[PDB]
Design a binder for these strands. Structure first.
Lengths: 54, 214, 32, 118, 122, 113
RNA sequence: ACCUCGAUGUCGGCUCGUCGCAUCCUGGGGCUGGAGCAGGUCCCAAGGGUUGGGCUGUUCGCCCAUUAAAGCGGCACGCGAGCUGGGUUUAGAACGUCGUGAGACAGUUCGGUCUCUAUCCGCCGCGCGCGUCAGAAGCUUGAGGAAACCUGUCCCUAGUACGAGAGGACCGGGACGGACGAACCUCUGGUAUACCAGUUGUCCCACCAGGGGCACGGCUGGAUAGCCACGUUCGGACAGGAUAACCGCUGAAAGCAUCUAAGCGGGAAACCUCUUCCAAGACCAGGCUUCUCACCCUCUAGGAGGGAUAAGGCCCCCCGCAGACCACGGGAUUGAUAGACCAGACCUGGAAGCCUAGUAAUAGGUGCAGGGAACUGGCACUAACCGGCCGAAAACUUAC
RNA sequence: AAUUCCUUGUCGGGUAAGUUCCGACCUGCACGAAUGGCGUAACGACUUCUCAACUGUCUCAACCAUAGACUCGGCGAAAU
RNA sequence: GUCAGGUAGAGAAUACUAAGGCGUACGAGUGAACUAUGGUUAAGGAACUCGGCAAAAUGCCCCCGUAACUUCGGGAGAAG
């Protein structure tokens, strides 16, 4: 099974647009007196100190 | 015309007849209902009664729903369904706020139980449609379970909508008919239907008088 | 058989069967 | 505890049975270990079962732990410190905290502790 | 669950010793025969001075089966061999003595002569 | 302890003697034939017991006329009026399926003195 | 000899279908050299059904058991990017015949690689987006579709009708089945890679005792939940409308007759309703009803753009018998959703230590003991968090 | 018959049923004596038929675990 | 081409292991269909098919006992 014909310009763009990313949802954390943004998943770990803020 | 009530399927057990036979029964908790809405022809174009069931804490109800129950004067419940009657000669004996119980049925009454069957996920043809596979020996090449042919060859040139192949099976509404009620346990509000009814333990079922033998 | 009459033998044998099926039906006409 | 529904953690059931012992042998030793998130969730019911054996400490429960962890210096710590520490708290001796993923494979990652609050 | 090609041990005294089932009577394309279902068999083994010789098609009824069989009470009956009793076209044994216990289910299927001659009906 | 208990509690049948696999027992099963009612005694050893409460189930294996029969009963069945344990067996299993291939002296069970 | 030789893979079998009717069974009739039973021939009818084996590569055919019946055909003599490769149709070798010979066969015999990661249409499933003149939510109507439609034996009627015997009914009732399908797991069975016990070889925990690793879970005997079938329960009904072949009533053209030209009726598994399921993307995008029903800023105010909200929803979190991901369903401290802990059910079957008897293998007591996952009921001990992103109204014409 | 077209020749044995198989007939299309004829104990990953045991080959499939398949992060082709 | 530990064993086969050497270079997950490689199976046991193809079965040591036929060696580990 090989592609029978060259795929049109419009046809490849429409499918290629579905290969995208997703920006995470960040949440404010007050550790060491400076407000940072971490995902709400890592909320508890940021206050304990288990996560480093590069 | 046809009685009906909303209940939840508890499980299966066995009990013994009067000739000392055995009848495999299914226990249904046809708990109390209320009538929250009544559907007449001059408003809705058909006749039916709307029933409510379950227990829900009033902090769990959407505000649009919490207003619908206040328009009938009842506390909110979880599940709201509808029993479709046929004429006003049957509708007239229901009334908003009236409470139904398991005692509307008697022993030996034939009922029809409806519910959503279990789910089996993405199931192949050999299981879903009851196909055959090719042989398990005598040279078959990686073809032990796949469906086989599909259609014609250059005439049909296509696949004839409605053919049977692999897909997600189960988890759809199904109705079994003419199940015989063995006993109505009015003290616990429990029905003992003889047989096997769709769903899982703790689902939601609707038992109604049999359309064929009622 | 490159001339390919090896397929006509089962065509010729079949014709004997059909012609036999003719006579037994006629055997039903007179007997009834 | 209830067996793993899906495929096992180490590529075989034999490996998982040896991998879950090494993770418990290292939790009771340090008090906080950091591992992959599905490895932490599978360890939690496994680890709290041995600490129950420690609480009702007898010769019978010493031999029941020794057939899992196979070590002899952790099993002493398990029957002299960890057991008597949780003599009053009823269940739930560990907690799972979720942290930032890895880098080479972006695997979800969590750290699992021993509750030391009471 | 005795089907075509199964071998059953004859419980009669007709001179047969073992039969091979040819067909299960009862309906079109029927598969299994339990206690009280009539088969068509061929005698695959007979005693020398016997009344019935090997290689003839004869009719018989099952009397015992290895697969356990339900009963309306909810109780089960299960023997340890498959056995058959050669009958004629009027539902009576060709032999005069029946060997070993038989199932109760022959009673409700009107095998009245077989039940009476059996040592123990279970 | 189950969710369905109230339904099975009424049907439960008391005064069942305490018997376990290995015991020899005789069951007085009722039989109906020609509108007549009588009892038939089935005597053998108990080789199984599959607990379910009301769904309890035990089987009794007997050797009769050179053929070994088995018969599976529900413990709380009404077709059984008496169960009378005779001897106490002394076995090491809980399902005695090894007796299905032993004939004669090799199939004798030991007695719990 | 018109398409294809810069390739349209050739016979059988398997899997999977779909259509025609020139109908094998079941359904309705006309005629009969049709007494009855049973037939013969023709007409109407495609809803369902149409078995398993022996011989041959075989289609075909013959045969063995049955059955209500074991239909005929089309779809590249359907179906090899779905499977086989027995045959035909490469290279080896031999037999008969032909040839002086290399070799050949219109004959036979033993053997002989079956390649491909699906781009497009097509089909089975599942999502994201927008629309349905504000934003949401609960419950539903049905245009239009999909599925199912099979049938036997016995007992009354009645040894009655018919017949001179032998034989033996129409119609109408009742019971029990075969095959097929759907749902379910109480029962019977099958499986069990974190359950329990026995045990062989070896290495280890200093040694005894007690255990562990490896050898298909080492091998054996059982095995709750889940998934299943060999298991359990249920289904294909009753009634109606319009008709086919056929049967007619009233009736002329044609003083009579005629089922026909005016009218009126009977009539079958075929058709439409009847039963189960999907279904408002049904663009005429539906109906009943209930919530929110509300603020600011800028272009030059015509409209637009931007911001912030309510009802509600999404994402993150604890999960599910829901599941490829997504989706669906439940829970989120005002908390029983999962784990842990306590107890029960069930499975295994009598733990470790000690005491006793034996020279010893080993046995008995403490003891329905010990160990244990899925099922049930309790208990906030552990984790559902001192949280982010979406998300609401130009009006006008006429009747009233 | 590794040879026989007509052919599934005819009779016998085996099977419930045997175009294959074994024994025999002779009407040898188109066997035949070192291109050897007829047999033969032992031997054959050769070809043909029958039987006991055994089994998922089948009636009729069901369940479990691993490697792919599916989801996520990295690198990243091909015939056409 | 040369060395050849221990315990079972006839063995340099096979299982575990000492000295010694490695964990070998994409991973993390998730009970989809389907494919591949292992495992178990009620009742029946070749009914599948071109054909018992593939699986299953038999499997070691010591005793007892072993047919036709024969080139007198065999058949023979016959069978049981």
């Amino acid at each position: 099974a090989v592609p029978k014909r060259r795929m049109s310009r419009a046809n490849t763009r429409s499918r290629r647009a579905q290969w995208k990313a997703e920006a995470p949802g960040l949440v404010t954390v007050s550790v060491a007196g400076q407000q940072r943004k971490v995902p709400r998943r890592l909320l508890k770990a940021a206050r304990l100190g288990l996560v480093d803020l590069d | 015309a046809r009685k009906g009530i909303l209940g939840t399927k508890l499980g299966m057990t066995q009990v013994f007849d009067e000739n000392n036979k055995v009848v495999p029964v299914t226990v249904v908790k046809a708990g109390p209902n209320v009538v929250t809405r009544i559907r007449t022809t001059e408003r809705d174009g058909y006749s039916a009664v709307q029933l409510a069931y379950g227990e829900i804490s009033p902090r769990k109800v959407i505000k649009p729903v919490a207003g619908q129950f206040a328009a009938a004067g009842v506390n909110p419940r979880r599940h709201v369904a509808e029993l479709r009657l046929d004429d006003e000669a049957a509708v007239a004996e229901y009334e908003v706020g009236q409470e139904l119980t398991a005692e509307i049925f008697s022993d030996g009454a034939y009922v029809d139980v409806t519910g959503t069957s279990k789910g089996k996920g993405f199931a192949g043809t050999m299981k879903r449609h009851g196909f055959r596979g090719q042989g398990a020996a005598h040279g078959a090449q990686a073809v032990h379970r796949r469906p086989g042919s599909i259609g014609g060859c250059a005439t049909p040139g296509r696949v004839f909508k409605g053919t049977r192949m692999s897909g997600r099976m189960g988890n759809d509404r199904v109705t079994t008919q003419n199940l015989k009620v063995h006993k109505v346990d009015a003290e616990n509000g429990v029905l003992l239907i003889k047989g096997a009814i769709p769903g899982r333990n703790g689902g939601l079922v609707v038992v109604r008088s049999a359309i064929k033998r009622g | 058989g490159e001339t390919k009459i090896e397929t006509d033998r089962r065509r010729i044998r079949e014709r004997m069967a059909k012609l036999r099926r003719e006579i037994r039906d006629m055997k039903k006409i007179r007997d009834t | 505890p209830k067996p793993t529904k899906g495929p096992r953690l180490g590529g075989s059931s034999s490996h998982q049975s040896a991998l879950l012992a090494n993770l418990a042998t290292s939790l009771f030793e340090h008090g906080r270990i950091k591992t992959t998130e599905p490895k932490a969730r599978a360890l939690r019911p496994y680890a709290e079962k041995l600490i129950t054996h420690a609480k009702k400490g007898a010769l019978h429960n010493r031999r029941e732990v020794m057939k899992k962890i196979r070590d002899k210096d952790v099993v002493h710590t398990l029957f002299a410190e960890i057991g008597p520490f949780y003599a009053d708290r009823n269940g739930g001796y560990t907690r799972i905290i979720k942290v930032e993923n890895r880098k080479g494979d972006n695997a979800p990652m969590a750290v699992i502790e021993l509750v030391r609050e009471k | 669950m005795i089907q075509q090609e199964s071998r059953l041990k004859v419980a009669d005294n007709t001179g047969a010793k073992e039969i091979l089932c040819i067909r299960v009577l009862g309906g079109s394309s029927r598969r299994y025969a339990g206690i009280g279902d009539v088969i068509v068999a061929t005698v695959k083994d007979a005693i020398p001075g016997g009344n019935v010789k090997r290689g003839d098609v004869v009719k018989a009824v099952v009397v015992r089966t290895v697969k356990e069989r339900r009963r309306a009470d909810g109780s089960y009956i299960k023997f340890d061999e498959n056995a058959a009793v050669i009958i004629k076209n009027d539902n009576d044994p060709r032999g005069t003595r029946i060997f070993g216990p038989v199932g109760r289910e022959l009673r409700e299927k009107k095998f009245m002569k077989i039940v009476s001659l059996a040592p123990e009906v279970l | 302890m189950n969710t369905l208990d109230f339904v099975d509690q009424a049907s439960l049948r008391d005064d069942i003697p305490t018997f376990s696999p290995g015991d020899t027992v005789n069951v007085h099963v009722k039989v109906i034939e020609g509108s007549k009612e009588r009892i038939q005694v089935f005597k053998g050893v108990v080789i199984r017991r599959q607990g379910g409460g009301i769904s309890e189930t035990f089987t009794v294996r007997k050797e009769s006329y050179g053929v070994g029969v088995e018969r599976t009963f529900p413990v709380h069945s009404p077709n059984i009026d008496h169960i009378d344990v005779l001897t106490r067996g002394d076995v090491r299993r809980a399902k005695l399926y090894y007796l299905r291939e032993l004939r004669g002296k090799k199939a004798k069970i030991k007695e719990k003195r």
